[PDB]
Amino acid sequence: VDVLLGADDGSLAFVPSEFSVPAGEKIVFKNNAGFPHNVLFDEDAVPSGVDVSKISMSEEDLLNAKGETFEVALSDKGEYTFYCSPHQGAGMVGKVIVN
Ligand SMILES: [Cu+2]
Asked: What CA–CA distance (Å, rounded) separates 56 from 9?
């Protein structure tokens, strides 16, 4: 399933902000507008047993063009918070429920 980075109107949002997927489904984050963006998972807001390092971009890796993607597939059930490193403090945060 596709998650946009930036809304069409320039808002600093993941689109959608909240959604659910079955365990293992691919999640494709797709750069849209309002650059730069990236995608990390918060070590303090993922299921016990999850290693964020292997599902997170480097903070130093920034997406600056429309249509670039970052794909992950989450094996473990429960709630994950993802965020954009440059825009963390502007509210560009989202939640995925893996079921
Ligand atoms: Cu961003």
From this structure: 26
What is the whole-number distance in angstroms between the Cα of residue 12 and the centre of ligand 1?
A: 6
> What's the rounded Cα separation, in Å, for the pair 37 and 25?
22
84 is in an annotated binding site: yes
Resolution for the entry shown, Å: 1.5
Q: Known catalytic residues?
A: 37, 84, 87, 92
Q: How was this structure determined?
A: X-ray
What spacing in Å lies between the alpha carbon of 41 and ligand 1's midpoint? 13
Task: Kindly list the domain boundaries of the chain, sorted by start residue.
Answer: 1-99
Yes or no: domain 1-99 corresponds to CATH 2.60.40.420: yes
